[PDB]
Amino acid sequence: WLPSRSFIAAVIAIGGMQLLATMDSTVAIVALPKIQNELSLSDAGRSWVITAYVLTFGGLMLLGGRLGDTIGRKRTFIVGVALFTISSVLCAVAWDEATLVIARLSQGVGSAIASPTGLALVATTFPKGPARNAATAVFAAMTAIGSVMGLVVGGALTEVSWRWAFLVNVPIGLVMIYLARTALRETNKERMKLDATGAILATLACTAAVFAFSIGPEKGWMSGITIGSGLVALAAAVAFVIVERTAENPVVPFHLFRDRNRLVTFSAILLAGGVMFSLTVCIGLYVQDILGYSALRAGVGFIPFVIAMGIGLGVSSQLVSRFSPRVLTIGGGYLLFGAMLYGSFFMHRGVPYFPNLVMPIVVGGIGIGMAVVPLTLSAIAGVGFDQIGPVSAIALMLQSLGGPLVLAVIQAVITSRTLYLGGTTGPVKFMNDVQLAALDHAYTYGLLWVAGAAIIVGGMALFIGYTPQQVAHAQ
């Protein structure tokens, strides 16, 4: 009850990077159409606005994870958050496509440098035990807070110009840099050297893969650029693996994958993050399009999701010290699966808010809050303080990567269903009631597919062999 001010300031400062990044991404998604109208942007720019940020977020994140070790996690976290804030400032004063794309690239650089270092700071500054559980709970809770409050900000500031939308990154960034300065404690001066070749190879492979995946649907899936970027990514990845095989300071430790339970945990993290991201996108689109709710209305409706995830994460953090991560993950998935089944069976257009919408979202949020803590706790387990960087970077990369990878499948299933039912393809303004009902049924079918994916997730999580002793009991 009422912990130390230093502890709460430290956890807030550490989770601040995920909070800020998710909130900024949500605001960008919400305010994307306004940028196109005001700046007179084409669909290519509509892609590029998010493409640059995701490109530099996925490309340099392993570089950031190792750079945290080579310079110091606190100091590189400060650098990353400051760079993100400055890039947001530059974006807020953008006047053409080039400067905004450069600002998005700089934001991606800042996020890639800072967020894996954020996970490493969760796992490093606080020793194993109740402190780590509380840090993880705050991490996930304020990530959800950032997402939903960014949706709220985007909905509220849609009347004013989009320039003001990106400025909320500034006060939050400054205050959380101040919190990291004053609160977080610096360790000894065990300066450690970085291996340039492995880092640059990993960066090249990741950036080529992200560029290929982003340019796929726009430029064509078998065009020259997409296949060239894909083959470049594959060659860079295989060269990176070959170099890491003999690296004295591995960028990614292939040594630490000896434990098969760790491989199971990482794959479960990937697929669970994918399911969660697909759920986010599908719920946002379904609420904003079918039910006709504004973005501000969507945010104030998802605030109960934030509350429910708060209770779920608190309960999971309390219960990890007694129950196995397998058990808690399965229970959270059970609650989330019940919520998804209820959503896919008893909700169509015109349903009320309190009966049919608050309860499934609250139950799903409680389940997700129960499931997140054990998974990421098992991710950061059995590692030295000199090995935490790459492990956290890989876990965060899997969590962020699984999202779009299965979201593409879910979108394909939904569009196939809505064309099977006879729904018109395009913006929801043109379609009349019949195509709207077809889209609603397609969204329910996509939710059923997401539920099947969650079934798979639990199937893999049933093999998580860790015991709570080596997770949340310190010495």
Ligand X SMILES: CC(C)C[C@H]1[C@H](C(=O)Nc2ccc(-c3ncccn3)c(Br)n2)C1(C)C
Ligand Y SMILES: CCCCCCCCCCCCCCCCCCCC(=O)O[C@H](COC(=O)CCCCCCCCCCCCCC)COP(=O)(O)OCCN
Residues that bind ligand X (CB under 6 A): 272, 275-276, 329-330, 332-334, 336-337, 368, 371-372, 375, 454-455, 457-459, 461-462
The full DSSP string for 275-343 is HHHHHHHHHHHHHHHTS---HHHHHHHHHHHHHHHHHHHHHHHHHHTTS-HHHHHHHHHHHHHHHHHHH
Nearest to 28 by CA among 103, 96, 81, 82: 103
CA distance linking residue 327 with residue 320, whole number of Å: 9
Which of residues 181 and 352 has its CB atom nearest to ligand Y in the complex?
352
Q: How far is the CB of 185 from ligand Y (least distance, A)?
A: 22
Using rule CB under 8 A, residue 341 touches its own copies: yes
Q: Of 152, 291, 340, 454, which lies in the binding site for ligand Y, with binding defined by CB under 6 A?
A: 340
Q: How far is the CB of 305 from its own copies (least distance, A)?
A: 21
Q: Of 72, 301, 360, 389, which lies in the binding site for ligand Y, with binding defined by CB under 6 A?
A: 360
Using rule CB under 6 A, residue 234 touches ligand Y: yes
Using rule CB under 6 A, residue 58 touches ligand Y: yes
Q: Of 50, 170, 232, 327, which lies in the binding site for its own copies, with binding defined by CB under 8 A?
A: 327
The length of the chain in residues reads 475
The full DSSP string for 113-153 is HHHHHHHHHHHHTSPTTHHHHHHHHHHHHHHHHHHHHHHHH
Which region, judged by CB under 6 A, interacts with ligand Y, from 92-100, 163-171, 187-195, 273-281? 273-281
Which of residues 21 and 309 has its CB atom nearest to ligand X in the complex?
309
Q: Of 72, 155, 273, 374, which lies in the binding site for ligand Y, with binding defined by CB under 6 A?
A: 273
Q: Of 334, 349, 382, 408, which lies in the binding site for its own copies, with binding defined by CB under 8 A?
A: 334
Residue with tokens 């962020």, as numbered in its chain: 400
125 sits in the region (left: phi over 0; alpha: psi -120 to 50; else beta) called alpha
Nearest to 286 by CA among 214, 366, 340, 355: 340
Which of residues 10 and 375 has its CB atom nearest to ligand Y in the complex?
375
CA distance linking residue 381 with residue 256, whole number of Å: 11
Q: From the CB of residue 349, how many other CB atoms can be counted at a distance below 10 Å?
A: 14
Q: How many CA atoms lie within 13 A of 93 on its CB side?
A: 6
CA distance linking residue 151 with residue 18, whole number of Å: 15
Q: How far is the CB of 455 from ligand X (least distance, A)?
A: 5
Using rule CB under 8 A, residue 465 touches its own copies: no
Encoded tokens for 361: 């979202």
- Whether 153 contacts 106, CB under 8 Å: no
Sites of contact with its own copies (CB under 8 A) = 327, 330-331, 334, 337-338, 341, 345-346, 448, 452, 455, 459, 462
Sites of contact with ligand Y (CB under 6 A) = 21-22, 25-26, 54, 57-58, 61, 139-140, 143-144, 147-148, 205-206, 209-210, 212-213, 230, 233-234, 237, 269, 272-273, 276-277, 279-280, 282-283, 286, 302, 305, 339-340, 343, 347, 360-361, 364-365, 368, 372, 375-376, 379, 395, 397, 399-401, 403-405, 443, 447
